[PDB]
Amino acid sequence: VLLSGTVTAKNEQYVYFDASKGDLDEILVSVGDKVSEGQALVKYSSSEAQAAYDSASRAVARADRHINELNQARNEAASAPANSVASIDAQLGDARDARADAAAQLSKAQSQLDAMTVLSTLEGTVVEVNSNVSKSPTGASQVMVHIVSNENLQVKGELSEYNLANLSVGQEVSFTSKVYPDKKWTGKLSYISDYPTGSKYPYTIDVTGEVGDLKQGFSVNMEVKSK
Amino acid sequence: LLSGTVTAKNEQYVYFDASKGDLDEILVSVGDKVSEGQALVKYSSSEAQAAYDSASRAVARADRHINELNQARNEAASANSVASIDAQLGDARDARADAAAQLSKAQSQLDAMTVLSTLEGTVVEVNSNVSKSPTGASQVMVHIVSNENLQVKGELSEYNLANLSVGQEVSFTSKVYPDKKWTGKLSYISDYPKNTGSKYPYTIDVTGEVGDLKQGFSVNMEV
Amino acid sequence: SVLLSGTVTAKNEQYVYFDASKGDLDEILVSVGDKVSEGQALVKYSSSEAQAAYDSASRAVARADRHINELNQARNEAASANSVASIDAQLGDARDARADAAAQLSKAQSQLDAMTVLSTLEGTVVEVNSNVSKSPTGASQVMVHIVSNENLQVKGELSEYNLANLSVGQEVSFTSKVYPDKKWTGKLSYISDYPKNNNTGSKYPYTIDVTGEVGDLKQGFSVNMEVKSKT
Amino acid sequence: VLLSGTVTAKNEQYVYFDASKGDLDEILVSVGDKVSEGQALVKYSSSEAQAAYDSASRAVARADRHINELNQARNEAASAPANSVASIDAQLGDARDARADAAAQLSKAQSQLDAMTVLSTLEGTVVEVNSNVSKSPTGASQVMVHIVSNENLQVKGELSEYNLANLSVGQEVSFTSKVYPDKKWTGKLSYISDYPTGSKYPYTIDVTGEVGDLKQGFSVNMEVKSK
Amino acid sequence: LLSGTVTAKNEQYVYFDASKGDLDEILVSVGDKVSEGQALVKYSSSEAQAAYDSASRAVARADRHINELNQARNEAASANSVASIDAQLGDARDARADAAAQLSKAQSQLDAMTVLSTLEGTVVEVNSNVSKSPTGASQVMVHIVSNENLQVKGELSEYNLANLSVGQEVSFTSKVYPDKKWTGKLSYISDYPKNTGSKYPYTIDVTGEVGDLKQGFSVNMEV
Amino acid sequence: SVLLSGTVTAKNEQYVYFDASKGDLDEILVSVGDKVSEGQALVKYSSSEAQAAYDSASRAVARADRHINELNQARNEAASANSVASIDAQLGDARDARADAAAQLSKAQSQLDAMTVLSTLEGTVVEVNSNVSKSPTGASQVMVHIVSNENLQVKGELSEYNLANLSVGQEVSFTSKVYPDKKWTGKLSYISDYPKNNNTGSKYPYTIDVTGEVGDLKQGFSVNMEVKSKT
């Protein structure tokens, strides 16, 4: 049995415009760069986030002071020659709670700041930048950065109803490429689906050995046995 | 003579939900077998955990206030008045009730950060690249199908609908394996067409010995 | 006489679409191919928050009543020499509080029964779908579709010519190319004055109600009809 | 010159589902009814509106009381044997203002109640009801009731680039109908456009005399002169 | 040899805006002539008028407070202290400034309930039936065109673009009136195609004697 | 050598779409067919509310400074016997207020200059449109489109075959069927590893930068090219 797939990349990352994050400052990457696993890619305007952060830490510090004046007032009104120590122990409770509130909010604003710059999840090739996107429910999704890893290649395809009854997972195969009639690369079948002129099910093969000169999107061809 | 396709019966589509914050991690690839009540996708449990902790501090605050109140009754009952201290003990009891309620709501909102499977089956599609902004279309992140309790669904025409059946135990073949028969019991004939004629979908619960039969096979069986 | 084409359609139907403003879905409690009668529930959203709202509201009426009572016991104690004018004012401000508590309560009541959508007709459920998104992701998400297989009708359109030949009330016979020995009757019940929207002419929708015994006549059937003239 | 239009109605009213108004109770009209100029058509759920209204009038009444206790307290503290009369004259100002606030809001909630039932703007024929609409940005506009008046008919059409240079507004014409070859109706041209195989401009004719048996949508035909 | 169409130069599309409340009345039919700064559509001026009145009461309240303040200075300056009364007179001045600001904002939001024309011209399209809910599409309620300062717009191909012109005074005809010529001065040739070839739009400001020439006419003029 | 087709495209461009979150539009202050340089304004929204925000913010810093000062004069008066601890606390709470006032002020500053959108490049404006709606009525409303007619390029796609014959850097000649006596040169600058998305094959986008004198060569021109092999 002769099959034909196309070689795809395994790992991608898309980056869409997030309206809820405000306004884009600059995309700091160019279509062609190989980016680190943790390299930055997009920076939103981070002034409102930094301001909310500062306000949060001032709220925390003010909570700590406030409990400190309450503390002195307590240990004065107590060892007092005898307003109430309990009347402000209440306030102490309702001030430690406000302190914990401001603490949690500070951490929230902290990551609300970290969210303003988008990092990669992978080292690959940026293949698309688009700095001209709008903040409006535009009816579609506005891609801003597309990164795909050119390593751990696979080859994906489909097979007919008849064609599934021709062996399965864990099989090693070898394929050929119409642009390099000489060489043949090998692969170990990684996945066959049982979920879809004939119904078609998708297969994926993790590729063995050296990639050599195979580019993504290359049309390939194989030969395996059936039943 | 009619044709139909064998389909699974139970699925689960998880769609990215923006209201639950943002995605942290999808916990299954493709081809995995999942079971009833199993972790599938986990949103960031952060501003949810903070709300839980705040609600907890709220119930503990209500408890502190009621202690500060009934001790202040124990003082002013053997010494403003017990009337307007017992009363505010009532309103304090109310406040503690509210605190426990919104605490439970915080718990539900919390463990909702992680969606669980509703079936035992195989994962078919995972799509971790999804836009938090509205796309204008559904965005599936995970799909589960069970390859058990199969069925055959199809359509009948205005004429062959004049064959009826509440459950004729029929049986079918398909040119993938032509020397085999599979039996099934009819289960549904629609009286309402969809949308040259009006077509009416039919279903049949396949019955036993479903060996190499899987869910893409075109299928024919006449009568 | 006058001949018309038309299709067998139902008269009464109901779609229930997903509603995010009602919260989250628990169960849909109906399976496709189920008879339902007017009033039966067909979807239940999770009634948790609505429950808590009902409880907190009842406690609002409770605390409000307690307040009116304590202010009452505290007005008489002042009528035997704050002052009874201060208490009168606070009373006027606690009756308002109790009215707000009542309104809040009934809001919780109607939001509570709004977590179970009910059927508007005797009918048969033709589609159920428990796979929806929350984010007004796309268009309308039909969750349950039901339609009465009784009181069947047939509809179509009419030429500008047919409008001058036809009046509402005229009797009608019709047949179906699948049951050629079987025949039906019916009556012209609605003729539209208003047009929808190589040969020309605008088309006006008509609907007739089938009369007499309906046999194994099922919706969607193509139908050929003769409208009887009048003496 | 021979023209061909179609007879249209002049006056319509559409009624779309309004999500911001809450939930539909019932459409109280049936496709075929002739409705009054002020007849009702759709009723939304009006319990939240009535509740907000009641709350508004209680807010007004509480404002009036409040200024009355402030009033007694003033005229006591004044002719007082000599807290401050000015200190609560301030409160009186800041209570008459709250009173005016609650008044305006009460009127607002009043029309927020009147908005819960939709009335006609015309007596005509309801031609469409649709009680099965959803509260979601459905991508389209969900018509709920469509009313068109079958009187003050017009006939509308278009004409080619050549065809405009054939006289204009204020002209009387007469037309014929392929379903009644006998009769001919007359009309007085009401509008020609200068704003668009040829560009087409639209004309409308108000119809003279008796409508007789002309239905809307009837294809008509005429004869007028050019230049 | 090229063809073009005569178009108007200045228009105005009014779209229904939900944020401005709801429509009260459109004040023009079709065929009417409107002029610069003329009432066109009027939204309901109700919750806007209420906000204006409230802002006015706010400025009068700030004035009352400053009088209550400096009179309280006139008492305690020849009798807490002038310090913390002069200071709060400063903050009161601030408050009056804010009140006047939000008052002016209330005025702008008020007269925005009524949109005015930006041209002198004829009204082309009025559409009073519009859904307050989002349609998923623009909803024009009124359209104004001026039938003065006409133009001719069209497109050139990749080849005939090799005729250039910053402003060749050309002239054209059209088979509506074949025995007449209309002169025009070129005004724009795009260097950027739109979207068999790449087409480049051109414009020409028509010049004088535009008698029976109106805005739908296909037009031809070669060179 | 290797021959390729391609179209004359520009390198740098800018769309400015309507933004409701910026308020209302006043003027667009550019007409189609205008040269613009990097930094020039191209739309001005009505800066009224932003102005009022700036003013109220400056008054916030004013009143805050007044407060810190009055508390300062009032701490010394207490340091010569409320108490100076109370004043110390209020001071710590007025420095916070002044910091909030500063942050609010700069928020008003950046929102103020955000009411004038500026150009990102030397370019020519190719479309202006002052007829928009506010209600995210539909899709994206392009209000002004500008694009540099300098630094022109040509782009297209490549077969799977072409990928093995071509490297970035190779010199290129090309011509246009409208100026048949005139010829151009250029260099291969970008070859995509990643494919877009009766005969078959996936296609990979390429872009080359034109070099030397650009004549009356205008964007969109169809172009035929020869890529020089290497010794």
mmCIF file of N, CA and C in Angstrom, chain B residues 1-84:
data_model
loop_
_atom_site.group_PDB
_atom_site.id
_atom_site.type_symbol
_atom_site.label_atom_id
_atom_site.label_comp_id
_atom_site.label_asym_id
_atom_site.label_seq_id
_atom_site.Cartn_x
_atom_site.Cartn_y
_atom_site.Cartn_z
ATOM 1 N N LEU B 1 -32.736 -0.461 0.172
ATOM 2 C CA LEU B 1 -31.308 -0.195 0.124
ATOM 3 C C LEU B 1 -30.941 1.225 0.554
ATOM 4 N N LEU B 2 -30.260 1.330 1.683
ATOM 5 C CA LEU B 2 -29.870 2.620 2.207
ATOM 6 C C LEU B 2 -28.482 2.572 2.778
ATOM 7 N N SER B 3 -27.855 3.729 2.847
ATOM 8 C CA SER B 3 -26.525 3.810 3.375
ATOM 9 C C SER B 3 -26.528 4.667 4.607
ATOM 10 N N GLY B 4 -25.625 4.340 5.503
ATOM 11 C CA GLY B 4 -25.439 5.066 6.745
ATOM 12 C C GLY B 4 -23.990 4.989 7.174
ATOM 13 N N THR B 5 -23.659 5.773 8.198
ATOM 14 C CA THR B 5 -22.311 5.809 8.749
ATOM 15 C C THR B 5 -22.347 5.415 10.219
ATOM 16 N N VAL B 6 -21.340 4.660 10.648
ATOM 17 C CA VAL B 6 -21.230 4.256 12.045
ATOM 18 C C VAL B 6 -20.608 5.403 12.834
ATOM 19 N N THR B 7 -21.314 5.869 13.861
ATOM 20 C CA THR B 7 -20.854 6.978 14.682
ATOM 21 C C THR B 7 -20.799 6.563 16.145
ATOM 22 N N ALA B 8 -19.923 7.222 16.897
ATOM 23 C CA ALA B 8 -19.933 7.082 18.343
ATOM 24 C C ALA B 8 -21.197 7.716 18.914
ATOM 25 N N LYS B 9 -21.499 7.372 20.162
ATOM 26 C CA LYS B 9 -22.723 7.840 20.799
ATOM 27 C C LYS B 9 -22.493 8.975 21.788
ATOM 28 N N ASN B 10 -21.371 8.973 22.505
ATOM 29 C CA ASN B 10 -21.124 9.931 23.576
ATOM 30 C C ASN B 10 -19.808 10.655 23.327
ATOM 31 N N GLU B 11 -19.847 11.988 23.365
ATOM 32 C CA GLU B 11 -18.672 12.822 23.156
ATOM 33 C C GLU B 11 -18.565 13.841 24.284
ATOM 34 N N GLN B 12 -17.509 14.647 24.222
ATOM 35 C CA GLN B 12 -17.399 15.839 25.059
ATOM 36 C C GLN B 12 -16.528 16.845 24.330
ATOM 37 N N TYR B 13 -17.098 18.008 24.030
ATOM 38 C CA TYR B 13 -16.359 19.143 23.500
ATOM 39 C C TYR B 13 -16.111 20.124 24.635
ATOM 40 N N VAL B 14 -14.848 20.423 24.903
ATOM 41 C CA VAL B 14 -14.504 21.523 25.792
ATOM 42 C C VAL B 14 -14.120 22.709 24.916
ATOM 43 N N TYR B 15 -14.764 23.838 25.162
ATOM 44 C CA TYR B 15 -14.481 25.078 24.461
ATOM 45 C C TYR B 15 -13.774 26.020 25.420
ATOM 46 N N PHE B 16 -12.822 26.787 24.900
ATOM 47 C CA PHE B 16 -12.174 27.791 25.727
ATOM 48 C C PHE B 16 -13.202 28.799 26.218
ATOM 49 N N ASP B 17 -13.267 28.970 27.535
ATOM 50 C CA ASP B 17 -14.180 29.913 28.165
ATOM 51 C C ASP B 17 -13.366 31.064 28.738
ATOM 52 N N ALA B 18 -13.634 32.278 28.251
ATOM 53 C CA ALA B 18 -12.876 33.440 28.702
ATOM 54 C C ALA B 18 -13.230 33.812 30.136
ATOM 55 N N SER B 19 -14.509 33.689 30.503
ATOM 56 C CA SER B 19 -14.964 34.092 31.831
ATOM 57 C C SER B 19 -14.208 33.390 32.951
ATOM 58 N N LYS B 20 -13.631 32.216 32.684
ATOM 59 C CA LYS B 20 -12.832 31.494 33.667
ATOM 60 C C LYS B 20 -11.368 31.920 33.664
ATOM 61 N N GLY B 21 -11.074 33.146 33.280
ATOM 62 C CA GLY B 21 -9.704 33.648 33.325
ATOM 63 C C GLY B 21 -8.945 33.309 32.048
ATOM 64 N N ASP B 22 -7.830 32.598 32.193
ATOM 65 C CA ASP B 22 -7.006 32.227 31.054
ATOM 66 C C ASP B 22 -6.411 30.841 31.264
ATOM 67 N N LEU B 23 -6.085 30.194 30.153
ATOM 68 C CA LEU B 23 -5.646 28.806 30.156
ATOM 69 C C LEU B 23 -4.303 28.656 30.858
ATOM 70 N N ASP B 24 -4.192 27.639 31.707
ATOM 71 C CA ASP B 24 -2.881 27.312 32.251
ATOM 72 C C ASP B 24 -2.246 26.139 31.517
ATOM 73 N N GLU B 25 -2.973 25.033 31.395
ATOM 74 C CA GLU B 25 -2.392 23.824 30.836
ATOM 75 C C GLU B 25 -3.498 22.874 30.403
ATOM 76 N N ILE B 26 -3.345 22.306 29.212
ATOM 77 C CA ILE B 26 -4.142 21.161 28.785
ATOM 78 C C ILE B 26 -3.382 19.899 29.174
ATOM 79 N N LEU B 27 -4.073 18.962 29.819
ATOM 80 C CA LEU B 27 -3.425 17.843 30.486
ATOM 81 C C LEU B 27 -3.478 16.537 29.710
ATOM 82 N N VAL B 28 -3.926 16.553 28.461
ATOM 83 C CA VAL B 28 -3.966 15.348 27.645
ATOM 84 C C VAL B 28 -3.545 15.690 26.223
ATOM 85 N N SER B 29 -2.787 14.791 25.606
ATOM 86 C CA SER B 29 -2.509 14.872 24.174
ATOM 87 C C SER B 29 -3.582 14.117 23.408
ATOM 88 N N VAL B 30 -3.276 13.677 22.195
ATOM 89 C CA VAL B 30 -4.211 12.881 21.421
ATOM 90 C C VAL B 30 -3.895 11.407 21.628
ATOM 91 N N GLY B 31 -4.886 10.561 21.353
ATOM 92 C CA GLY B 31 -4.726 9.128 21.476
ATOM 93 C C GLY B 31 -4.807 8.584 22.885
ATOM 94 N N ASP B 32 -4.754 9.438 23.903
ATOM 95 C CA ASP B 32 -4.849 8.965 25.275
ATOM 96 C C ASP B 32 -6.251 8.453 25.574
ATOM 97 N N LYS B 33 -6.320 7.486 26.479
ATOM 98 C CA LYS B 33 -7.587 7.012 27.010
ATOM 99 C C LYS B 33 -7.854 7.744 28.318
ATOM 100 N N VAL B 34 -9.022 8.369 28.422
ATOM 101 C CA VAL B 34 -9.426 9.040 29.648
ATOM 102 C C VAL B 34 -10.649 8.326 30.205
ATOM 103 N N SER B 35 -10.899 8.548 31.492
ATOM 104 C CA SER B 35 -11.968 7.873 32.209
ATOM 105 C C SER B 35 -12.858 8.901 32.895
ATOM 106 N N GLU B 36 -13.952 8.401 33.471
ATOM 107 C CA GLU B 36 -14.916 9.246 34.166
ATOM 108 C C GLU B 36 -14.228 10.115 35.209
ATOM 109 N N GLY B 37 -14.580 11.399 35.220
ATOM 110 C CA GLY B 37 -14.016 12.344 36.164
ATOM 111 C C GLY B 37 -12.501 12.376 36.152
ATOM 112 N N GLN B 38 -11.921 12.934 35.093
ATOM 113 C CA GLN B 38 -10.477 12.992 34.927
ATOM 114 C C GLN B 38 -10.074 14.391 34.488
ATOM 115 N N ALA B 39 -8.978 14.892 35.057
ATOM 116 C CA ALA B 39 -8.475 16.214 34.707
ATOM 117 C C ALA B 39 -8.253 16.323 33.205
ATOM 118 N N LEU B 40 -8.686 17.446 32.630
ATOM 119 C CA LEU B 40 -8.625 17.627 31.184
ATOM 120 C C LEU B 40 -7.943 18.933 30.802
ATOM 121 N N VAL B 41 -8.484 20.065 31.248
ATOM 122 C CA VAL B 41 -7.820 21.354 31.096
ATOM 123 C C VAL B 41 -7.880 22.079 32.432
ATOM 124 N N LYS B 42 -6.823 22.825 32.742
ATOM 125 C CA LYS B 42 -6.692 23.531 34.013
ATOM 126 C C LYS B 42 -6.430 25.007 33.734
ATOM 127 N N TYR B 43 -7.405 25.849 34.067
ATOM 128 C CA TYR B 43 -7.200 27.284 34.014
ATOM 129 C C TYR B 43 -6.327 27.725 35.187
ATOM 130 N N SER B 44 -5.812 28.948 35.091
ATOM 131 C CA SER B 44 -5.002 29.498 36.168
ATOM 132 C C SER B 44 -5.839 29.651 37.431
ATOM 133 N N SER B 45 -5.434 28.958 38.495
ATOM 134 C CA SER B 45 -6.090 29.044 39.800
ATOM 135 C C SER B 45 -5.322 30.061 40.639
ATOM 136 N N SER B 46 -5.614 31.341 40.427
ATOM 137 C CA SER B 46 -4.876 32.392 41.118
ATOM 138 C C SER B 46 -5.813 33.445 41.699
ATOM 139 N N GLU B 47 -6.498 34.202 40.837
ATOM 140 C CA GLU B 47 -7.479 35.169 41.318
ATOM 141 C C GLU B 47 -8.698 34.461 41.902
ATOM 142 N N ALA B 48 -8.849 33.165 41.612
ATOM 143 C CA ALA B 48 -9.831 32.299 42.251
ATOM 144 C C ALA B 48 -9.388 31.876 43.641
ATOM 145 N N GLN B 49 -8.133 31.433 43.782
ATOM 146 C CA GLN B 49 -7.621 31.086 45.104
ATOM 147 C C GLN B 49 -7.624 32.299 46.027
ATOM 148 N N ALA B 50 -7.309 33.477 45.486
ATOM 149 C CA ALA B 50 -7.356 34.694 46.287
ATOM 150 C C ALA B 50 -8.766 34.967 46.793
ATOM 151 N N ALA B 51 -9.772 34.770 45.935
ATOM 152 C CA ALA B 51 -11.152 34.974 46.363
ATOM 153 C C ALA B 51 -11.571 33.946 47.405
ATOM 154 N N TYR B 52 -11.079 32.708 47.290
ATOM 155 C CA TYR B 52 -11.346 31.719 48.329
ATOM 156 C C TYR B 52 -10.747 32.154 49.660
ATOM 157 N N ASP B 53 -9.474 32.558 49.653
ATOM 158 C CA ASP B 53 -8.819 32.971 50.890
ATOM 159 C C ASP B 53 -9.511 34.181 51.505
ATOM 160 N N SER B 54 -9.941 35.129 50.665
ATOM 161 C CA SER B 54 -10.645 36.303 51.170
ATOM 162 C C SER B 54 -11.982 35.919 51.792
ATOM 163 N N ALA B 55 -12.720 35.007 51.153
ATOM 164 C CA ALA B 55 -13.984 34.555 51.728
ATOM 165 C C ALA B 55 -13.761 33.839 53.057
ATOM 166 N N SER B 56 -12.691 33.043 53.148
ATOM 167 C CA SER B 56 -12.360 32.380 54.405
ATOM 168 C C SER B 56 -12.064 33.397 55.502
ATOM 169 N N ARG B 57 -11.228 34.395 55.196
ATOM 170 C CA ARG B 57 -10.997 35.479 56.145
ATOM 171 C C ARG B 57 -12.296 36.184 56.512
ATOM 172 N N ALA B 58 -13.274 36.184 55.602
ATOM 173 C CA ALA B 58 -14.558 36.802 55.904
ATOM 174 C C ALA B 58 -15.344 35.981 56.920
ATOM 175 N N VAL B 59 -15.334 34.648 56.792
ATOM 176 C CA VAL B 59 -16.045 33.837 57.780
ATOM 177 C C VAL B 59 -15.345 33.911 59.136
ATOM 178 N N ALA B 60 -14.007 33.898 59.143
ATOM 179 C CA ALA B 60 -13.291 34.032 60.407
ATOM 180 C C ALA B 60 -13.526 35.402 61.028
ATOM 181 N N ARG B 61 -13.701 36.429 60.194
ATOM 182 C CA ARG B 61 -14.020 37.758 60.699
ATOM 183 C C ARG B 61 -15.408 37.792 61.325
ATOM 184 N N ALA B 62 -16.380 37.124 60.701
ATOM 185 C CA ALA B 62 -17.708 37.037 61.302
ATOM 186 C C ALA B 62 -17.657 36.315 62.643
ATOM 187 N N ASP B 63 -16.838 35.262 62.739
ATOM 188 C CA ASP B 63 -16.693 34.545 64.004
ATOM 189 C C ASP B 63 -16.055 35.429 65.074
ATOM 190 N N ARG B 64 -14.997 36.154 64.707
ATOM 191 C CA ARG B 64 -14.395 37.094 65.646
ATOM 192 C C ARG B 64 -15.420 38.106 66.135
ATOM 193 N N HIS B 65 -16.210 38.665 65.214
ATOM 194 C CA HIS B 65 -17.185 39.678 65.599
ATOM 195 C C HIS B 65 -18.247 39.112 66.537
ATOM 196 N N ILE B 66 -18.693 37.870 66.310
ATOM 197 C CA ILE B 66 -19.703 37.313 67.209
ATOM 198 C C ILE B 66 -19.103 37.042 68.587
ATOM 199 N N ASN B 67 -17.829 36.636 68.648
ATOM 200 C CA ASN B 67 -17.191 36.472 69.956
ATOM 201 C C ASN B 67 -17.056 37.810 70.679
ATOM 202 N N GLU B 68 -16.573 38.835 69.970
ATOM 203 C CA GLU B 68 -16.491 40.183 70.523
ATOM 204 C C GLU B 68 -17.851 40.675 70.989
ATOM 205 N N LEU B 69 -18.923 40.114 70.430
ATOM 206 C CA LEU B 69 -20.274 40.561 70.736
ATOM 207 C C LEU B 69 -20.875 39.874 71.946
ATOM 208 N N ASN B 70 -20.799 38.547 71.995
ATOM 209 C CA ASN B 70 -21.407 37.840 73.108
ATOM 210 C C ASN B 70 -20.543 37.905 74.358
ATOM 211 N N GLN B 71 -19.227 38.100 74.218
ATOM 212 C CA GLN B 71 -18.440 38.427 75.405
ATOM 213 C C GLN B 71 -18.835 39.796 75.945
ATOM 214 N N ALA B 72 -19.036 40.767 75.048
ATOM 215 C CA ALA B 72 -19.550 42.070 75.446
ATOM 216 C C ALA B 72 -20.960 41.984 76.011
ATOM 217 N N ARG B 73 -21.695 40.908 75.718
ATOM 218 C CA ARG B 73 -22.937 40.667 76.442
ATOM 219 C C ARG B 73 -22.661 40.093 77.828
ATOM 220 N N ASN B 74 -21.731 39.137 77.923
ATOM 221 C CA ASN B 74 -21.392 38.550 79.217
ATOM 222 C C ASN B 74 -20.883 39.599 80.196
ATOM 223 N N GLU B 75 -20.315 40.695 79.692
ATOM 224 C CA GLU B 75 -19.871 41.762 80.583
ATOM 225 C C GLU B 75 -21.028 42.664 81.001
ATOM 226 N N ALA B 76 -21.822 43.132 80.038
ATOM 227 C CA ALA B 76 -22.886 44.088 80.316
ATOM 228 C C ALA B 76 -24.172 43.440 80.817
ATOM 229 N N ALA B 77 -24.187 42.124 81.035
ATOM 230 C CA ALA B 77 -25.357 41.446 81.581
ATOM 231 C C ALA B 77 -25.208 41.091 83.054
ATOM 232 N N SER B 78 -24.006 41.228 83.618
ATOM 233 C CA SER B 78 -23.794 41.094 85.055
ATOM 234 C C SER B 78 -23.102 42.326 85.626
ATOM 235 N N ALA B 79 -23.238 43.471 84.964
ATOM 236 C CA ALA B 79 -22.627 44.712 85.420
ATOM 237 C C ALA B 79 -23.684 45.666 85.965
ATOM 238 N N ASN B 80 -24.834 48.967 74.415
ATOM 239 C CA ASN B 80 -25.623 49.564 75.486
ATOM 240 C C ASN B 80 -26.875 48.732 75.757
ATOM 241 N N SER B 81 -26.843 48.012 76.885
ATOM 242 C CA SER B 81 -27.865 47.071 77.348
ATOM 243 C C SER B 81 -27.730 45.722 76.652
ATOM 244 N N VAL B 82 -28.546 44.753 77.070
ATOM 245 C CA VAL B 82 -28.552 43.447 76.420
ATOM 246 C C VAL B 82 -29.417 43.476 75.164
ATOM 247 N N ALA B 83 -30.411 44.362 75.118
ATOM 248 C CA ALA B 83 -31.290 44.502 73.962
ATOM 249 C C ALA B 83 -30.501 44.770 72.684
ATOM 250 N N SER B 84 -29.891 45.953 72.588
ATOM 251 C CA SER B 84 -29.168 46.339 71.381
ATOM 252 C C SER B 84 -27.764 45.745 71.355
#
